[PDB]
Scaffold this active site. Structure first.
Site, mmCIF file in Angstrom:
data_model
loop_
_atom_site.group_PDB
_atom_site.id
_atom_site.type_symbol
_atom_site.label_atom_id
_atom_site.label_comp_id
_atom_site.label_asym_id
_atom_site.label_seq_id
_atom_site.Cartn_x
_atom_site.Cartn_y
_atom_site.Cartn_z
ATOM 1 N N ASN A 11 29.443 -5.087 14.388
ATOM 2 C CA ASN A 11 29.185 -6.478 14.445
ATOM 3 C C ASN A 11 29.295 -7.091 15.807
ATOM 4 O OD1 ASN A 11 29.141 -9.431 14.000
ATOM 5 N ND2 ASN A 11 30.352 -9.498 12.422
ATOM 6 N N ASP A 12 28.006 -7.303 16.361
ATOM 7 C CA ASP A 12 28.017 -7.608 17.642
ATOM 8 C C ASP A 12 28.216 -8.771 18.188
ATOM 9 O OD1 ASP A 12 26.737 -5.351 18.878
ATOM 10 O OD2 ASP A 12 24.681 -5.785 18.184
ATOM 11 N N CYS A 13 28.345 -9.800 17.019
ATOM 12 C CA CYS A 13 28.827 -11.281 17.268
ATOM 13 C C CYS A 13 30.260 -11.457 16.992
ATOM 14 C CB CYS A 13 28.159 -12.205 16.613
ATOM 15 S SG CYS A 13 26.330 -11.987 16.747
#
Lengths: 822, 822
Positions: free
Chosen positions: B489-491
């Site tokens: 999850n990049d965010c």
């Protein structure tokens, strides 16, 4: 042919047809909020930074060009058209666009309906205002529905058009049909997170309906010219969620014959302190106070008319510092209105955002911005003084500089390269021009950080020392300055050697070492080296001034010994110490940059224009035989017809274009000024007229671009498009041409001790008057001019013959009358 | 409703109208040359890298969308139309688009004229070929002029649309009206300098005329739908100089009734060795040998038809490794054609270029590309093996990795961030899937550089060790892995704390230190930690395998002790060691990522679906009550309704979109697979059907995007657009859904020692057959399936009951028949 005409009494350029060779734009705003507006209402708006805070969306390279913007769709019993002609392109009975100072009007009429829209950015406001006048010119009644339209950008212009994978899901608005003065739509994308700003788009009556979703308003498979909502005749009342937020109100208008109705639309940039962002505890609703405040300031036509009038007053005051009266009305037009006006635009926007510059990659250039000052010091000195501090603050402590910096943050970056060795001396150039214009030496004492770093602050004069010494400590084998990545000519990259594509020359890693030298930087060190020495001397630093004069003296001899080709100046020595710009070669024998700048520094100048043997006279004559064209002097000749792998970007352009044989207009003034130095005013004026907008207006079909401002580049003679301009508005040309015409052709120029009056313009302007306000006094200067080569003016000051060409400054409030004969 | 239908016999999706909810595209080419082609012929082509070698220009966010492309303007006695409907949008009597495997056809007919265009990239060719069939369907004669059209991009797509200040002056072409097989135009921009490549655009007859300048062909103030040359009815024969190069030939066609004519157009990418670039001494003329060669290979219809047939054969062979026969024809459609086909696209293009991804910023993601392999190992193992080497080569020596790398150069960059701590373990994930599919352990012995650096080469197995140890040496206070910038999850950015706009979260400087941990990476270390241990063991490294099993064992206990919330798994610990993903909070109580991945690693799994008390059963049940929607499981719940400044990008999306409450489809398979692990096949199939293209085809008006491929994200239930997809085609969903349906629902999956057959799909697929070619042998697997929870298959192998669910590999050439009951 022509596509309009100047209105000098009104200070406008009147465009009398939609069908121009290219979109012709104006800039609105002169402070912190800016609009690009074409003669078809295309363009966009941004706050301070065109990359970072762009309110509205604009597509470059659109088909057709300029097919988006601020539109007003008129529905007349089912027939829909736009007064700006595009996007609908319905036949009109009348069209006219007037581009004025910080405002434009656009009028379109069809089937007995006339819409006039006035566009401007008010003084002291971060908003674009539109006063729309709708007139029934027909015989019977009219029932119309008007649909305003604008399309938002999501603030970050680069993210906005590369990052849809995230972008499509963040678009958020708020709708306010019952605003205290009408109706407003709020574009509040990313306000939920880090942005403390949003845009408001409002009308000053109760709108019948609204739209905030572009796909609903325009409809599937449709262009803006086929937009569905205006054709159905009623808004959809769409509430955007992601996708493409827009702003749009419909307004019902009934008009008896000859009746008119006035509407005021407003597009504002609003900013709330972080503590003050939400109306509600839940933080779902933008606090609207400041937006309502703005909207109450333009709730009526009367208020709008007063702001417009204040803007006229503002430009009138600005244009009151320098003007001229002569027989030449094109000359007068440029000196009195358009060149000074363009200089204000270049000061504000630099080289970042036009219809050619995408307002993405470029902020404020360190060298561009210093040079812009030379043309802006006379207009608003206080803001000029502040800008110098901001630029100097992006300088490093070793005297080297960040090549550009970001307008919003004022912080330097290496986005378009670093290590250009000509950058540091420009800082001296702008500071000296500022102190001559103002007599304000106190700026030398202002503390200035290196790289914006707190605790690194030293007086600005010390920044200028670092600039001088940087060159002193980076000279090559001949005593000429090492070039680095490049000099003023960005495409002269002698430390590059890239044979693989994919990375710009401007940012690509450079091979260390070598002995690449620049004669241009050499000239530059002589010119600005003296200015620095004279400041040190006046500062009372006598050892410092003398040392510097020594170094300048030496660079002068180096330029003539090791930078001289025989009939003109060499351009550079490459990485291995081989010459560039020599008759020994078949291409690129002669380059304009060293010729103009060296003679401007006084190098090679003899006794007269009569003394043909003097190096300056030769270089200039070589420049007239080899570089000069009907449309201006090309950069070098002949153009390179194959890639020169040791020379960088210059040879990558097709011959006759840009750095490879194009006419860079910015370099032209340097030669023109040089011609005045050597006393050939008639030649100097001729060079001037070939690249100057008012004189090229009659070949608008050749120039293509705006007839009222300077462009960066004109296709050179080895180009099949010779004569056609690219990159209008944003160019050092503006500042440098103003310096040229106002200080050397007309010859009225500020020095620390007095006004120098030394005109050099030739037989084409036999008499003229300059009105110059300097140091609080007004100088009225009448010139009787024979035009003769080598003939320089004799002054009479307040009725009494005086010696020399300098008039010492009179107390503010004084009026001095200077009469010149030559 | 629907806008087309599948043709399974032909392996096509048939689109029966231009009027889709959104442009629906296909990909052409599966090797080094690629075309995005919409059902209206919109899109573009690129060689290897969509940012660096883009042949043709495409505008994202156009008005209308997809209004540029490969057009053929038909002039029929003054009436001009296009068979693709757009850009002209003339009424047609018939329209049909068929999207096939590596090819599409587009047919449009009007006033007794029919044009069918077949588009494909031939196997072994860097070109896009068009076979056009024009048919007279009318009663009398037809005299037509056809105008081909395409618009070039200047190779660097990012430069092409940001850098006009230089761009407008470099456009160069060469025109060849008398080409050996017809006529060709050469786009040779920057060939003069560093590029050794140019594009050729040709037709296989003598063209009547040509155009290479867009403004001439289209005409001032005109859209592509109003293009002037086709309306005048004769080419202008324009020769571009700068501005906008295009490719265009006119061809005269006379047709008796019922008569047809066939034309072959070719758009090629050509590359000459630097020594071989010029035809001439003067270096003004591109060497055309290789281009003529290409053009002779498609000079006739027969040649074109054979290349098309070879391409069918190529896909037939590719699709022969796994297929199934059942009662469910949507299930069958996906397993047999579209999912495997999409997996090939994602392997080639990664996440860089679609109609959502701009082919600018993203190359090949380190984690995306490893995960794509899991879905591609079965198709072309040799190219899979090579890709693993290329990815591993972008790993650093400390085990950390470049987050993505550039397709053209294969070199890592930090353009979209660095320091994502979940990246290294993915490398293990792809290598293990490759060795299970192939039995090729020798890849572990291939030498591989760290950061592409010569002399740094070590065996790939040693790269996998660095990957395992990186996690081992970067664990937080609870023994869970430190998160870094983010995980999968990049965010989820816990080390960020940015409250100022203008810079992406993905690249913005992170605050050092803290104790931010990730339960996802924890799960990931358990799953891929075992795979690494089993490889070390098989390698004969017994101490190594045992040590690793120890660490995996420990992370398992850490996940259940300090990563367990009571009814589901926690998500993370923030910088100060505070929990995220706990019922203690009002928003973001439960996140999907840890639930699926932990149960996939076996963590919390008890004896039966009957054992509700087991943590895995609870987490999954919590996931069904809180995360599951009609359109799939959302990422977490509830969505955040205000910015969480300590958490990064996740809360910056409006609720229900993307990382903040959107349905990330890629994460769904993980839960679905987990359901099969715990024995609830009926639930697992249900999750599958909600996000799978063939099942969502009947709500095409809701999904909006392509009915034939997976999308990245579907609007979640807190979104007002719930159900609508964004970011189609390029998603890990494809690979992971193929893994899910083929290896866990149908249950046929490769292990180092045998084929495991362990179906878990529920009562909706009572019987089916899988045909699986593995290790050179064919396995025919018939399954009789009661669908009952907890019921796992009993094998009969070649008529004889056997124990367990693993069938050891038979010699190549063998045919094994496996019959399963459950």
């Amino acid at each position: 042919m022509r596509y309009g005409h100047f209105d000098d009494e009104a200070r406008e350029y009147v465009i009398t047809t939609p069908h121009t060779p290219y979109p012709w734009i104006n800039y609105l705003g002169s402070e912190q909020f800016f609009s690009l507006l074409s003669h078809q209402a295309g363009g966009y708006s941004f706050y301070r930074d065109a990359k970072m805070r762009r309110l509205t969306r604009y597509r470059y390279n659109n088909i057709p060009a300029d097919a988006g913007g601020r539109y007003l769709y008129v529905n007349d019993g089912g027939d829909v058209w736009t007064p700006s002609w595009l996007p609908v392109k319905a036949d009109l009975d009348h069209f006219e666009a007037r581009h004025g100072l910080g405002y434009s009007t656009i009028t379109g009429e069809r089937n007995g309906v006339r819409v006039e829209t006035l566009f401007f950015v008010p003084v002291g406001e971060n908003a674009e205002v539109q006063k729309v006048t709708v007139t029934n010119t027909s015989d019977s009644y009219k029932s119309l529905t008007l649909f305003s339209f604008v399309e938002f950008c999501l603030w970050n212009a680069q993210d906005d058009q590369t990052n849809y994978q995230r972008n499509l899901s963040i678009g958020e608005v708020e709708v306010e049909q019952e605003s205290p003065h009408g109706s407003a739509i709020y574009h509040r994308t990313e306000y939920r997170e880090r942005r403390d700003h949003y845009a408001v788009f409002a009308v000053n009556t109760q709108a019948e309906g609204f739209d905030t979703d572009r796909d609903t308003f325009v409809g599937a498979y449709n262009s803006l010219g086929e937009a569905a909502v205006p054709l159905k005749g009623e808004s959809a009342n769409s509430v955007a969620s992601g996708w493409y937020p827009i702003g749009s109100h419909s307004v019902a208008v009934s008009l008896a014959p000859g009746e008119s109705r006035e509407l005021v639309y407003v597009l504002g940039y609003v900013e709330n302190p972080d503590e003050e962002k939400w109306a509600d505890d839940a933080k779902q609703v933008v606090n609207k106070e400041r937006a309502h405040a703005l909207l109450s300031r333009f709730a009526t036509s009367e208020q709008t008319d007063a702001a417009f009038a204040a803007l006229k007053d503002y430009w009138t005051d600005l244009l009151s510092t320098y003007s001229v009266s002569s027989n030449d009305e094109k000359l007068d037009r440029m000196v009195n209105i358009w060149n000074q006006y363009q200089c204000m635009v270049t000061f504000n926007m630099s080289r970042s955002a036009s219809f050619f510059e995408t307002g993405i990659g470029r902020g404020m250039g360190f060298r561009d911005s210093n040079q812009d000052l030379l043309g802006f010091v006379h207009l608003i000195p206080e803001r000029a003084r502040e800008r110098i501090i901001d630029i100097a603050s992006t300088q490093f402590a070793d005297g080297s500089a960040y090549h550009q910096y970001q307008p919003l943050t004022k912080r330097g970056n290496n986005d378009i390269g670093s290590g250009f060795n000509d950058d540091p001396l420009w800082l001296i150039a702008g500071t000296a021009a500022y102190i001559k214009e103002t007599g304000d030496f106190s700026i030398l004492d202002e503390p200035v950080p290196f790289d914006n770093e707190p605790g690194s602050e030293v007086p600005l004069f010390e920044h200028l020392t670092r600039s001088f010494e940087f060159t002193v400590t980076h000279r090559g084998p001949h005593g000429l300055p090492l070039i680095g990545r490049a000099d003023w000519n960005d495409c002269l990259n002698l430390n590059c050697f890239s044979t693989t594509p994919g990375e710009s020359f401007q940012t690509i890693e450079n091979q260390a070492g070598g002995v690449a030298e620049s004669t241009f930087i050499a000239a530059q060190f002589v010119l600005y080296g003296e200015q620095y020495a004279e400041l040190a001397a006046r500062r009372g630093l006598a050892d410092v001034a003398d040392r510097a004069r020594g170094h300048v003296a030496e660079m002068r001899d180096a330029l003539l010994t090791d930078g001289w080709d025989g009939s003109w100046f060499l351009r550079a020595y490459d990485y291995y110490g081989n010459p560039i710009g020599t008759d020994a070669h078949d291409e690129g024998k002669i380059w304009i940059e060293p010729q103009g700048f060296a003679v401007m520094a006084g190098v090679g100048v003899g006794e007269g224009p009569q003394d043909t043997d003097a190096p300056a006279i030769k270089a200039l004559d070589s420049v007239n035989e080899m570089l000069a064209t009907d449309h201006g002097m090309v950069l070098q000749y002949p153009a390179y017809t194959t890639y020169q792998v040791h020379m960088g970007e210059v040879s990558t352009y097709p011959p006759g274009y840009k750095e490879n044989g194009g006419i860079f207009c910015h370099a032209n003034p340097w030669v023109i000024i040089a011609e005045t130095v050597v006393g050939r005013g008639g030649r100097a004026f001729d060079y001037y007229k070939r690249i100057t907008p008012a004189y090229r207006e009659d070949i608008s079909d050749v120039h293509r671009l705006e007839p009222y401002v300077y462009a960066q580049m004109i296709a050179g003679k080895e180009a099949v498009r010779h004569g056609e301009a690219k990159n209008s508005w944003l160019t050092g040309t503006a500042a440098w041409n103003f310096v040229t015409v106002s200080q050397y052709l007309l010859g009225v120029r500020p020095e620390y001790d007095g006004l120098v009056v030394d005109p050099q313009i030739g037989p084409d302007v036999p008499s003229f008057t300059v009105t110059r306000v300097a140091r609080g006094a007004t100088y009225e200067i009448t010139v009787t001019n024979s035009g003769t080569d080598g003939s320089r003016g004799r002054l009479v000051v307040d009725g009494t013959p005086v010696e020399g060409n300098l008039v010492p400054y009179a107390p503010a409030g004084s009026t001095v009358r200077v009469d010149v004969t030559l």
